[model samples]
Target chain A: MRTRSTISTPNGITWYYEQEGTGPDIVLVPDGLGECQMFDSSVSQIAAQGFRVTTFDMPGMSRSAKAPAETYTEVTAQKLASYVISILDALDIKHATVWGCSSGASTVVALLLGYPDRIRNAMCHELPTKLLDHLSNTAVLEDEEISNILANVMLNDVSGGSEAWQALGVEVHARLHKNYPVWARGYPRTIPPSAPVQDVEALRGKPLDWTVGAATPTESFFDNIVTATKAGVNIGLLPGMAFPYVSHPDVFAKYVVETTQKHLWNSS
Target chain B: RTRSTISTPNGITWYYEQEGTGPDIVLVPDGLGECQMFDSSVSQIAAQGFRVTTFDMPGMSRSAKAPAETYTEVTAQKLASYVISILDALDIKHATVWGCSSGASTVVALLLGYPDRIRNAMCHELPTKLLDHLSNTAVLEDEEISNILANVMLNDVSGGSEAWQALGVEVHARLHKNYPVWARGYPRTIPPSAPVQDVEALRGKPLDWTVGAATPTESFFDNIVTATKAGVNIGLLPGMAFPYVSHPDVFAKYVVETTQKHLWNSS
Candidate 1:
């Protein structure tokens, strides 16, 4: 398993991060700012199986510095790319796999859009396409496929195990298994097909893996204040939901261990 | 106990969420505010043993005639008329009036302008700029006032190390990916400090709660959670129906208490 460390960007900003196992470098863009330490339970399990996993605090969150001049709205995508590139340079990692969720997915999109040659395989979930209508809506940069991938990310974390991951994988795969069969079956029509399988397969062979599950957020109808409370209460309501393939670290570590140029991908 | 609605003297309608079943307790909210702000605090006080009656202030929300001019108290007398009308509509001859922020300012004016309606008042977070001067420069048209209020709606202001961490880790991620209007809302501005009572001191206490910037509606919800959790019964609702997402554990804890007390008080 790897440990926590900090790497400085070219512009002199320090980023707090961690690494696990070894092989091809796998950069994991976290959901948002609880801190890299939050990945311990989820990613550590996967690292236990062998594979290097890396994560870092974003520019304005946790141990990192706040955007110096209201730069948060802008440079978000570039910031993610910069974090990946800087960390890679600091560790001498070339052609690393990029993994992300929500905004992280957008960041992954940013990496692919501007630094395509630098990435091996990209794994993004819910990449925020909702913001394409207006620049002020998101972190500033936007794209369609990237948006779809980003939009798939969850607003909150889930709770419990490896079996949970398998159960969820089975469920989610069944879903995309129908939406776009060509992805796993053939071409255009096959896209989004048997997604959970692809996710499972990626876990077995590469550090890049992404999957959506059957879990749904609370709210049977539109009740604003009531719903907001329900959401607020849910934060620490249940225990953590993570297991083998369903876990970001597990997939990241496993894929990194199983493949030389392993990477993950997220699609609408 | 049971929630109800009443029409103001000006024909503007006001809906209230009620708790407890004793002497009427009217909580006046800030200008352009809603009843949600006092949910937790009032609920707790209600549970401790008193009926809590809080509704939308006149000229706001569903209430009639929300003239932009209503932002200032030039219309303060009209507000006084609305307060009297709500009381008459409820058939309550008299009640304790507790004001929060602009509500507090309104209460002070009520005490000065129409003293017969209120028995006692509990005031908090009153913007003293309306009532003080000389030493109250911090709030007297400070340059950061507008920026501060805008940030309240957009960003967390406690300036804690954990705040930005929370924002970066969870808050911003959700906004960027799912809801960007929140980010856009960060710089939102309020109607300029309207015409309010211009005074310096009354009863020797500084009127303003200079702890932090104007809190967002969410923070008010959080306060309700805190007050209710601390045993103030007739307080906060456990839901955020408009911006649904389950919140902290304490929220649930308070909901159970206030709701349970509501049933007890009503019964």
Candidate 2:
């Protein structure tokens, strides 16, 4: 049976989250200000694969209480990372694998850097690389600008290789786009284009999985590999996938199973 | 006269408002690009006999976000594009541009990069390494840019709303009026480190550029000095910071003088 619940951060913001299945733990962070259900395309399959899966609305998003717009601003990556641990703390979980999609990837990073003990491993999907630019100064974004980009990616991402799956993705992306003005008030405008990815030394040798869309432009995909190697993480191509968890949940869960079991392989 | 939203092919939507009547003088909104911040200025500036436009940048307050890739581009360039996108949407060919702080830097970008679309520009202050990264290259996918004539730009947005919507999908996707789309533009995922900009680009541009601000920091002053050396006009506002918010009339008067300064001079 699946369970839905809410957790209140020490800061007083109540976050809404959901949990499913039983076994080892895994958490899903959707794109900016998105509800964990953005993972709906895949969570069930993953949960069935024998892992306790968790999803939640970040603070100030959807069911969560709103925080000051400043809550999302520059140099606050550490704060964002702490919230993830806070979510797990509510569930009484000690350690779990975290999968951060797109901007959520930055959170995975902040956690890996600041709270490494809590994470069994991390997957950064389409990890952004230009965050150092904000160390000095940053840009402001409106909610609509954020939703469009996110929706654009979410659309056509269901790699079921069938028009029906693709058609279903369109509605999901559309509603995702429409919800921005109402759901994401003060995000990316203050998010500083990717969390500061500069603390590479702390991340060296960490089991960071950097995944990118196989349909990703060859140049950008190639660069993703090069950047990961430099930062000491492993990179892989999501076969016929983009937002693989959304488009290829079966595949994504299989990959998750493989990633967690690999240490099992090495241990055995 | 009206308020509306503009959507790009890639899916970003911008909310904008226009009031008063006369020549166009679009305000390059700062912070979240909320028009409320521009409220005092917009009214008073339009009172100066100009049609004023204001907009929330995509992904902020009232606007829709662009593709996830769009955010990866340089801040200044994307902001500059926001103004052009607004102008293009409204079908206004030439208009004076004005902005403060971060938006001010965007004004500088317009003054330098897209002179053809601008009549003049007024800048209050430039924030960010905006001046430092003037020459930064931006792109998505493989091929990149100095080329936003095309192309576009996500989240840690919600934790639960997406799930709720997904529930709708699982329940019935076709039940609503919505469709997903692809992010368009250069597919370059990562841009190189901060690039440099040549202030010289603004030196001989045909458009008139004016900059003024209370010195909040050495970097701010240095930016003014940089503009001064580049031959752009300059002034200092009365307040310590945010004169537009505290002294709307005072900011308004500056607009009058700066926009009409050339007309007063012998043609």
Candidate 3:
């Protein structure tokens, strides 16, 4: 059974969240697209792996209540840290492994940075570095590939060419376009305050795994990976781009499950 | 009269526009393409006693796309030459060059590759090192922005005739198409500074730095501070990333004041 609810945040918008399954808690955060619904199939799969899986839409995107732009302007590492802790508290989960992809991966790093006690582990997959000097995020697919994916996945929504699907499409389009700059500016401000592993040393025996695809323009991603591994944290690499879970969920689940299992020995 | 044309030498009908008249200043726009992106900034500078010129680089906007090439030091060198080429064709010499973002990196290349042609230069948000941040390829790989681009493309919201006239969709699409070259090719080659003595020679020539408060200041500061400390008339302006668009009046005023103090006096 799936349970869904909405919670208001002090940062000026409410979040829509969902959870299912049971056992050790796992919370999943969406990427820049910021819709929890898109993760339906993937979340269902992970839930079947014997864990309570939770996911939510960040404010200003998707089902979340719209807030003023200033709200997003105040969004930072500290706020993200609060958001995660509040979510965990709301669910009454004392500690949960927080998993996120892309921009959400950056948030996972922030959570570990500001509030380490609340998390058992963190899986930040396909994380990009601070947009320290660059403008726009990279566009992975070629122009043609982008067009095709839209037509197949979005236009032909499971709604079967219904008017509701089209309306939803347009709404998604408008929201995403407006919200792009919000996340773009907010991404860098959320870079981990210190190295992720050391910040999470309170959970010294815990696990924090950083996973990336093979073709990532390696330097920035690998540089941090080297430091984390040296500090005795777990790291993994899969055979795909930013959303490895979407491409290879079984393999992705295996990695997450293994990382979660490592805590068993530590706790014992 | 407003100027627009696809110049023939590069086999690209390059779009170049010229306005106002006094000192010569060539504006190589950021990857957003062409003159309109900087209309407010260009007009403001031009109005203030300078014949400001703006042009579209190859594979972007009105210009025809070039064959696939690795963007690098050689590419920046070629772009530097192209700016000079534009100046020569226009029957002008000894102009200041100003660039922002990737365009700023090109200004750096111009100083290194063709120092004689430039009188002074302005670089905004110039990155000091290659791969200082994640590449666009990596950012695009993120499913969110990727899907957003795909959806925008499919809906015809950002491209085609109806939308091309607007900055939002038009600039977004043009920037995406040129992403491979812009992020991967250009900055990969230009470092923060040139040879100290070579840079010292240009001490008389001014280098202006404009940075956004939202951007990381360390790299830009680290890259240019050496020259500033060495008595390079390096004028620094702390502002937004796209001040030309965001704060045109203020940026225009700043441009006019800086030109008078630095380039015009030296020239």
Candidate 4:
């Protein structure tokens, strides 16, 4: 297991990051101003599953240094996308699977589109539909694969594993009160609509996996299914899970470790 | 609570999504439609104990194709009329409302033209210059204003790295993006200050809440001042041209605050 360390990225911003295990490379993009400790339980679990996991505090969040003044004014998340490559450069990581949720989902798509060569795979969980602009959440759900995933999730069973899920939630807020700046503070509640709508064609050759949860409208998974089929993205189903990395560490780690690089040809 | 559509007598059909059950809170989105700006915010705001109603404005994706005449409804007065038509169809007699960018122009319109139907008006990123001039009918006047709006939109924003820019160029190219569909509704000369009547009307309305800006250009601050009359609590939201997308949490917090007054003060 590796410990947390800080490094100044070539992009001129400083970042705090950690790595654990040492097999298949996976980097976790923090959701919107999120930091490393967010994956506390999942990191070690994925590491133990025979894969190296990288987690970092995005610039100006938690232990990372304050970002440049420009980042705060940025309406579009251009820097956040570029920072993914910079994150890799500082760690000497040539390539890795980039995974993120929510605002982090925006970063993953940006990385896939902006620095496609650097990201071996992109696992975007609960992505904002607007970023891709391919489909809306209003459609009816008819996909059996997804319906099964949703049916399996139970309030009690998911609750059974909520111990760490609930605790980790408060920990980030702890960081916010102490470590974060006033400008970076609203991250917990809202993130910029900085995620631009990307051409799904940019995703055609990219190895992509999109994960949606029950917390979302669950309107239609066909958009995910058909788009994955067309764009070559793998649908990562966490049925009963929203933030799988937090809610179900074992499952999250297992999926993260096992799904690396295989879906380039097939989603299953 | 529901997803439905309503066609006003003017031959425009609006697509809307509703959630929660309480006093109505209308969200009028920018030209990008409600989906881009208000999708998840609708979900989040709904959980906060109000029936949040948001929709596609005619030419948007989810909504029906509107008549060519509908596109001509650009001024706040014209835009506000359609919004009023929708509210009448939804059976909402009066409600608190919020809007961002040009959408906030709807808030302005309702706050002005249909003041009786408005409970509490929350306007974010109101394009005061654009709105103030939109009602004017001069051709060269419209071109100058358009130039200013475009100039401000492009130069005033920043972020994304060189690598990101390189990728962005490639991705968008693959997406075959187009320039924003020019909205021809609002036409007026870009003015040095807001319309005095709009300012006076906004000042007297039932508005009390926080404000947020992504990049507070001198222009936008002036708009905020002109729109709110210094009565609004200043800069309480997380910075964004559209806090509905950037900070829906804060957006909802202020929404709850703004609407509570209407609900609290009801006789």
Per-residue accuracy of model 1 over A61-160 as CA lDDT, tens digit each = 5555433433232335555566667767887777767766545655665675567678776665433332222223332333443334322322233332
Prediction-by-prediction clash tally: 85, 49, 9, 7
- Once superposed on the true structure, which residue ranges of model 1 sit more than 4 Å away at CA? A66-71, A131-210, A217-268, B1-267
**Candidate 3 Cα errors over 4 Å, as ranges:** A1-268, B32-34, B67-74, B136-166, B181-184, B190-202, B234-238
DockQ of 4: 0.01
lDDT of 2 at B264: 49
lDDT (tens digit, per residue) of candidate 4 on A1-268:
5777777865567778888888767899876546578688888877886778888886766777567755433424456787778778878888778788767877788887888678778888755443222111211333443224322332233323456544756656556444333222333223335553346676776677777554332222223433444455555466344466666667777777767746433534
Tens digit per residue, CA lDDT, model 1, B1-267: 556666554556777777886666676755434555455566566765567677765444444344434333333344556677777877766566655445544665565555556554443333433222212323324334434433443443323333223434333333222112211211121112312323232332212211112232322333232222322212222332211012323432442343343345445
TM-score pick, better of 1 and 4: 4
Instruction: List the DockQ of the predictions in order.
Output: 0.01, 0.01, 0.02, 0.01
Candidate 4: residue pairs that collide? A78-B160, A79-B160, A114-B167, B1-B18, B1-B19, B213-B240, B214-B240
Second chain TM-score, each model: 0.50, 0.68, 0.75, 0.73
Q: Is candidate 3 or 4 superior in DockQ?
A: 3
Estimate the TM-score for candidate 1. Answer: 0.31
Which candidate number would show the highest lDDT if scored against the true structure? Answer: 3
Against the true structure, what is model 2's DockQ? 0.01
List the global CA lDDT of all models: 0.43, 0.59, 0.60, 0.59
TM-score of each: 0.31, 0.44, 0.43, 0.41
Give me candidate 2's TM-score against the actual structure: 0.44
